[PDB]
Amino acid sequence: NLAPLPPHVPEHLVFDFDMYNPSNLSAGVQEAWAVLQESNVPDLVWTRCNGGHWIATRGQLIREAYEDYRHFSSECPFIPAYDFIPTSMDPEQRQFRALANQVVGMPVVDKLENRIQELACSLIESLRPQGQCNFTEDYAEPFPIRIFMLLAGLPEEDIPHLKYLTDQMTRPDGSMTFAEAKEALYDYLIPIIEQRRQKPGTDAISIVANGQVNGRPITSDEAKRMCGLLLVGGLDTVVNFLSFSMEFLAKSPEHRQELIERPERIPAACEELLRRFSLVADGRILTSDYEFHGVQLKKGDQILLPQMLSGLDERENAAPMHVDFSRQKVSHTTFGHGSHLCLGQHLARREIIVTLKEWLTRIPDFSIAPGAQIQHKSGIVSGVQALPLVWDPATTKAV
Ligand code: HEM
């Protein structure tokens, strides 16, 4: 479905890329997006897919647009009932982020690290003697939701229902509309926020519920909308990213062996994997008519600014599809750039590093299940549909 081409858009800039179903997704999702960086493709193009929108294809422009919040607004960040905070905001933004940093900043992640390891260990040990798993379902999906319950001081018994609600927001089975799933999340959070307003702990919800905004107490509406984002922001991104990384390690024994031999390289490897298997593609909306790098943008045009593409740009990193854990400068915008830079980036890195450290020492040798062709999916958060892995349980190390 190709939306009618707006009069202000010149035909030479038209490239009908579909962010939800790119051509040759079969070759890998990053590769599918990287078509936008072929030499015949301009730095800024218009697609008639998905309502019609601009796409910045190079890291320079992606970074610039994210820095220029006055022209490129977050009021409409998705192509093509959402009310989470502080996503859709462009003074308030700063205070909400400051409050979120209080609950997921480095000192919190540092305190949580060993608990993250103990969770990783328990999951891996549960899988280890089987000699197979679907990594995405059996390790990746249960992990970040459990980390959120730790962060937010919520009981383990609440996981199935909360997981169901967040699953309906991104992959509905039809039982709930997005609005219904969101409201049920709020029905869950509201009593807890109220309770911890009056009797706080040191968990994330307690800290949020007692925050201040513009010199007055954070409202219940503001607090639930922040807690909601802290929950959903760290689920599909981590699930899918872990899956891309493990798929790669399964298919590249030489890279796997490098991390087995030199575990001290795992933090640097994490960063290089974040670049190579970057997965988010958000956008902005034009606040006014604006000429950007020789291209006339119109007030209200949407522009896709794919975080994924900056680090894949050969102008930012040489031989960008190659994975090299020793890169001296790993340039990427995997966690975003500018005023909405991911608040969960420190927690996410710790989850990744802990996962790789524990998997590589317990199950150092694993492969893709023979005959399986790994399928990717594309959209705002690109991903791995399933990741069937196999290993010999006699090569593994028991707890
Ligand atoms: C590999 C994992 C992750 C990736 C790649 C990722 C990526 C991103 C990106 C690109 C943005 C900016 C979106 C934009 O500018 O439009 C963002 C924002 C955000 N992230 Fe993450 N994220 C990850 C993990 C997490 C985790 C674990 C959490 C929570 C614990 C989290 C919470 C948030 C929140 C609350 C925002 C909104 C920030 C704002 O608007 O001020 N993320 N993330």
Side-chain angles (χ1 to χ4, degrees):
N1 313 298
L2 302 174
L5 183 70
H8 70 285
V9 180
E11 284 181 32
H12 74 273
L13 296 181
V14 179
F15 291 79
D16 299 307
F17 181 82
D18 182 349
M19 69 178 285
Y20 294 105
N21 187 39
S23 290
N24 317 101
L25 178 54
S26 65
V29 69
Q30 291 80 11
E31 288 85 351
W33 282 72
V35 71
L36 291 160
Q37 295 171 329
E38 292 177 8
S39 59
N40 71 303
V41 189
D43 285 359
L44 180 55
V45 297
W46 179 268
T47 180
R48 297 176 288 180
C49 302
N50 297 303
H53 60 91
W54 294 105
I55 307 169
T57 68
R58 299 286 181 179
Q60 185 205 0
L61 284 81
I62 291 164
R63 290 163 186 279
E64 280 186 34
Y66 279 127
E67 299 173 358
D68 188 6
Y69 67 94
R70 288 181 185 270
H71 286 120
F72 298 102
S73 176
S74 288
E75 186 193 39
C76 200
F78 311 120
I79 284 143
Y82 191 94
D83 63 12
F84 291 141
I85 288 168
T87 302
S88 293
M89 294 178 177
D90 296 319
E92 279 191 280
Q93 172 188 37
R94 287 180 206 110
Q95 300 169 70
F96 285 113
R97 285 182 58 85
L99 179 57
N101 263 136
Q102 198 168 166
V103 306
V104 295
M106 196 66 79
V108 175
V109 176
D110 288 342
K111 179 147 191 185
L112 266 156
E113 181 188 341
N114 194 269
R115 311 291 74 73
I116 304 173
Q117 193 276 338
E118 295 166 347
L119 167 63
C121 180
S122 62
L123 285 168
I124 291 167
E125 179 55 33
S126 80
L127 296 174
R128 187 195 51 76
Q130 298 174 341
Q132 64 181 78
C133 68
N134 168 10
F135 174 84
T136 300
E137 181 66 13
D138 298 337
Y139 181 91
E141 286 281 355
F143 186 62
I145 183 72
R146 277 169 182 69
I147 298 306
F148 181 83
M149 308 306 269
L150 291 157
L151 178 85
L154 301 169
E156 215 153 50
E157 311 92 274
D158 289 356
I159 290 173
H161 179 63
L162 199 53
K163 182 60 154 63
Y164 184 77
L165 294 183
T166 60
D167 282 353
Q168 297 329 289
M169 283 171 332
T170 58
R171 283 175 304 178
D173 62 40
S175 300
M176 306 188 88
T177 63
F178 179 89
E180 285 171 339
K182 191 194 63 168
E183 284 304 314
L185 176 57
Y186 294 162
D187 291 348
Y188 171 81
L189 290 171
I190 284 165
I192 302 170
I193 290 156
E194 176 54 16
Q195 212 282 316
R196 295 178 189 188
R197 172 98 73 166
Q198 297 164 310
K199 198 175 186 175
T202 57
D203 62 283
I205 295 170
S206 288
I207 298 313
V208 174
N210 291 104
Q212 300 266 110
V213 178
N214 292 333
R216 49 75 189 167
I218 185 166
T219 69
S220 164
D221 174 274
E222 287 163 346
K224 66 175 162 49
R225 288 157 77 203
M226 204 164 328
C227 286
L229 193 58
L230 288 169
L231 166 60
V232 309
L235 307 181
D236 291 348
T237 50
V238 176
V239 169
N240 282 314
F241 179 78
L242 289 175
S243 302
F244 287 122
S245 290
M246 289 297 290
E247 174 191 12
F248 174 75
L249 292 179
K251 294 174 167 181
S252 190
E254 285 170 323
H255 287 88
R256 193 165 75 236
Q257 189 56 32
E258 176 174 3
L259 309 181
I260 287 156
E261 285 177 14
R262 328 232 72 88
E264 71 279 0
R265 295 193 169 173
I266 293 166
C270 169
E271 208 68 15
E272 170 73 344
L273 296 167
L274 285 162
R275 180 197 66 79
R276 175 59 173 81
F277 300 108
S278 199
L279 72 175
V280 179
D282 261 33
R284 298 293 188 259
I285 188 163
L286 273 294
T287 63
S288 66
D289 296 349
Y290 179 46
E291 194 191 313
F292 185 63
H293 290 270
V295 182
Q296 186 63 54
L297 312 180
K298 186 174 182 66
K299 182 174 167 173
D301 284 354
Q302 286 191 283
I303 178 166
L304 185 69
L305 303 167
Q307 284 87 349
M308 184 202 289
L309 287 183
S310 303
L312 298 179
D313 191 342
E314 84 271 9
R315 303 178 189 167
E316 292 207 3
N317 300 279
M321 309 303 296
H322 294 186
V323 172
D324 195 302
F325 300 150
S326 297
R327 285 185 188 262
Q328 122 198 124
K329 193 208 276 290
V330 177
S331 178
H332 71 75
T333 59
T334 293
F335 291 115
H337 184 69
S339 61
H340 293 270
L341 182 77
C342 180
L343 294 157
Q345 62 162 327
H346 309 302
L347 179 59
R349 284 193 181 86
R350 202 66 50 90
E351 294 179 74
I352 295 154
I353 290 163
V354 167
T355 291
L356 295 178
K357 283 167 82 198
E358 187 64 9
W359 195 286
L360 291 171
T361 51
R362 302 293 175 99
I363 308 162
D365 197 331
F366 57 95
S367 299
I368 305 294
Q373 300 169 22
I374 308 306
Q375 304 299 126
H376 294 169
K377 56 180 167 196
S378 182
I380 304 161
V381 180
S382 292
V384 176
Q385 293 284 30
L387 184 60
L389 299 184
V390 296
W391 59 90
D392 176 357
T395 71
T396 65
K397 189 172 174 193
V399 61

